[PDB]
Amino acid sequence: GWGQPHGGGWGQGGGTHSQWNKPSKPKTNMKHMAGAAAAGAVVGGLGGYVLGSAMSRPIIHF
Amino acid sequence: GWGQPHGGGWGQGGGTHSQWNKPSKPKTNMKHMAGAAAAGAVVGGLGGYVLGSAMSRPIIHF
Amino acid sequence: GWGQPHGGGWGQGGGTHSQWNKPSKPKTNMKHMAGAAAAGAVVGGLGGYVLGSAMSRPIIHF
Amino acid sequence: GWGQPHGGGWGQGGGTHSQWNKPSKPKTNMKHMAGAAAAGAVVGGLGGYVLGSAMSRPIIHF
Amino acid sequence: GWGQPHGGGWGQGGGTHSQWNKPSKPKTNMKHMAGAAAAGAVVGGLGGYVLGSAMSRPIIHF
Amino acid sequence: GWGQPHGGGWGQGGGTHSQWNKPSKPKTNMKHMAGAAAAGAVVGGLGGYVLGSAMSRPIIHF
Amino acid sequence: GWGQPHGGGWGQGGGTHSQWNKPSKPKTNMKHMAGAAAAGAVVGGLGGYVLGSAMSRPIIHF
Amino acid sequence: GWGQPHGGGWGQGGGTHSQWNKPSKPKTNMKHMAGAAAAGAVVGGLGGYVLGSAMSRPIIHF
Amino acid sequence: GWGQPHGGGWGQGGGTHSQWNKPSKPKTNMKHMAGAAAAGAVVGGLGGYVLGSAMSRPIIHF
Amino acid sequence: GWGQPHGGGWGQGGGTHSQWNKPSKPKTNMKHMAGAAAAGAVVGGLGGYVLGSAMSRPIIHF
């Protein structure tokens, strides 16, 4: 089967939304990876009213 | 079967929402990974009204 | 079977919501991992009104 | 069978919600792991009105 | 089967939305990767009212 | 001197307010009046979040 | 002097306000009046978020 | 002097406001009046977000 | 002096406002009046976001 | 002096405003009047975002 019927309206009723991003020196390192991954929505910096999705069925031979 | 019918409206009734992100020196390291993973929504920096999803069925031979 | 019909509206009745994130020097390390994992929503920095999901059925040979 | 029909509306009746995160030097280390895990919602930094989920049935040969 | 009928209208009821991104020296490094990945929407800098998607079924021989 | 600095914010913290007015046959009669009167706010039917005032200094000769 | 500095913000924190007016046969009669009167806000039927005022200094000779 | 500096913002924090007016046979009668009157805001039928005022200094000889 | 500096912004934070007027047979009668009156805003039928005013200084000889 | 500096912006934060007027047989009668009156804004039928004013200083001899 499988399925994700995400549904309905969404949002702010009214009023205000204030988003600030002020990081100084973030660091990300990686070394030696050989797997698989997925994510519909990834937030690095900032945002909203962001809709993502993912659907993945990879085959890896190694 | 499987399924995730996430549904209904959502949000703030009204009023205000104030979000601040001020990290100084976060660090993430990784080394030597060979598995699999998934997540519909990942928040690094900041956000809201963010909708993600994931659906994954990988095959890894190694 | 399996299934997760998360449903209904949700939010703040009204009034205010104030979220502050001010970490100084968090550090995360990892080394040598070979399994599998999943999570629909992961919060690193900050957020709200965040909806995620995950559905995963990987096969790993090693 | 299996199933988790989490449902109903939820939130704050009104009034206010104030969330502060000010950790100084948290550290997380890991070394040598080869199992499996899942969690629908994981909070690192901060948040709310966060809805996650997980559904996982991996097969690992090793 | 598989499918993700994300649907319904979404947005801000009214009022305001203010988004600021002021990172100083973020750094991302990577070295030696040979797997597969997908994500419908990825936010580096900033944005909103962003809709992405992904659908992927790669075969990798190695 | 004289003065009425009515002040401060007021209202419902949140939650609900339900007001019903269902009178059947109210009757008001008057006959032969020759004086003076004042009231800042008068509620006949129904209401709320009603702010009135009065300030009066009439001279009547008769 | 005299003065009425009514001030401050006012309203409903959030949530709901439901006002119903269903009178059947109200009757008001008057006969023979020769005075003076004032009121900043008068509610006959229904309302809210109604702000009135009055300021009156009539001279009547008769 | 005299003065009425009514001030400040006002309204509904959010949520809803539902106003119904369903009177059947109201009747108002008057006969023989010779005075003076004032009111900044008068609500017959229905309304809201109604702001009125009055300022009156009539001279009547009779 | 005299003065009415009504000021500040006003309105609905967000959400909804629903106003219904369904009177059946209201009747208003008057007979024989010889005075003076004022009101900045008068609501017969229905309305909102209505701003009126009045300023009056008549002289009547009779 | 005298003066009414009504000021500031006003309106609906967002969301909706629905106004219905459905009276059946209202009747207004008048007979024999010889005075004076003023009102900046009068609502018979329906409306909104209506701004009126009045300023009057008549002299009547009779």
For residue B46 the two structure tokens come to 């900041």
Cα separation of D46 and E3, whole Å?
Answer: 31
Instruction: Provide the CA A10 distance to its chain's centre, in angstroms.
Output: 17
Query: Closest Cα of chain G to B23: distance in Å?
Result: 32
Say whether D36 sits in a helix, a strand or coil. strand
How many inter-chain contacts (C to H, CB under 8 Å) are there?
5
Chains F and A are touching, with contact defined as 3 or more CB–CB pairs separated by less than 8 Å = no
Paired with B33 in beta bridges are A33, C33
H33 vs I37: CA distance, rounded Å: 12
Q: How far is I29 from chain G (nearest CA, A)?
A: 10
Dihedral of CA atoms I9, I12, I13, I14 in degrees, nearest 10, equals -140
Contact D30 C33 (CB under 8 A): yes
Return d(Cα J5, Cα H53) in angstroms, integer.
11
| Sequential DSSP letters for J12-61 | E-BSEEEEEE-----EE----B--EEE-SEEESSEEEEEE----B--EE-
- The answer to whether the CB of E32 falls within 8 A of the CB of A60 is no
DSSP string over chain B = ------BS-EEE-BSEEEEEE-----EE----B--EEE-SEEESSEEEEEE----B--EE--
Residues in chain J: 62
Question: Which DSSP helix (H) or strand (E) runs through A20?
Answer: strand A16-21
Given a contact as 3+ CB pairs under 8 Å, which chains touch H? Answer: A, B, C, F, G, I, J
G17, G21, G30, G49, best to mutate vs chain I, most I CBs in 10 Å:
G49
- To the nearest whole Å, the CA of C29 is away from the closest chain D CA by 5
Helix (H, G, I), strand (E, B), or coil: what is residue H25? Answer: coil
Whole-angstrom Cα distance, residue D17 to residue D49?
Answer: 12
Contact in structure between E34 and A62 (CB atoms under 8 Å): yes
Cβ contact G9–F9 (<8 Å):
yes
List D20's β-bridge partners, or say none: C20
- Contact in structure between B24 and C48 (CB atoms under 8 Å): no
Give, as one character, the DSSP assignment of residue H40: S
Which chain H residues have a beta carbon less than 8 Å from that of G35?
Answer: 35
Contact E2 B47 (CB under 8 A): no
Instruction: Please indicate if any CB of chain B lies within 8 Å of the CB of H16.
Output: no
Please answer yes or no on whether I13 and A15 come within 8 Å at the CB atom.
Answer: yes
DSSP letter assigned to residue I32: -
Neighbours of F31 (CB within 10 A): 10
Q: Which residues of B touch H13 (CB under 8 A)?
A: 14-15
Residues in chain A: 62
C11 Cβ under 8 Å from any chain F Cβ: no
Return all residues near E57 (Cβ < 8 A) that are at least 6 apart.
Answer: A56, A57, A58
* Tokens 């500031």, residue located: J8
Chain D residues touching F12 at Cβ < 8 A: 14
Q: Which residues on adjacent β-strands are paired with residue D44?
A: none
Instruction: Return residues 23-62 of I near E (CB < 8 Å).
Output: none
Residue C26: what residue type? P
H8 is in an annotated binding site: yes
3-state secondary structure of D32: coil
A8 three-state secondary structure: coil
DSSP string, chain C: ------BS-EEE-BSEEEEEE-----EE----B--EEE-SEEESSEEEEEE----B--EE--
Give the closest-approach CA distance of F55 to chain H in angstroms. 8
Measured distance CA(H3)–CA(J3) in Å, rounded: 10
CA distance G12 to chain B (A): 10
Q: Check CB contact under 8 Å for G55 and I10.
A: no
Nearest to D39 among C9, C39, C53 (CB): C39
Rounded to whole angstroms, the Cα distance separating I28 from J25 reads: 12
Gyration radius of chain E over CA positions: 18
Residue of E nearest to A32 (CA): E32
- Ranges of beta strands (E only) in F1-62 are 10-12, 16-21, 27-28, 36-38, 41-43, 46-51, 59-60
Q: What experimental approach yielded this model?
A: cryo-EM
Resolution (A): 3.3
Residue F16 near residue H15, CB atoms below 8 Å: no
Q: Is G7 annotated as a binding residue?
A: yes
Residue pairs spanning A and H at CB distance below 8 A: 5
Phi and psi angles of residue I27, each rounded to the nearest 5 degrees, phi first: -135, 135
Nearest CA in chain J to I51: J51
* Chain mean position to CA E10: 17
> In this complex, do A15 and H13 lie within 8 Å of one another by their Cβ atoms?
yes
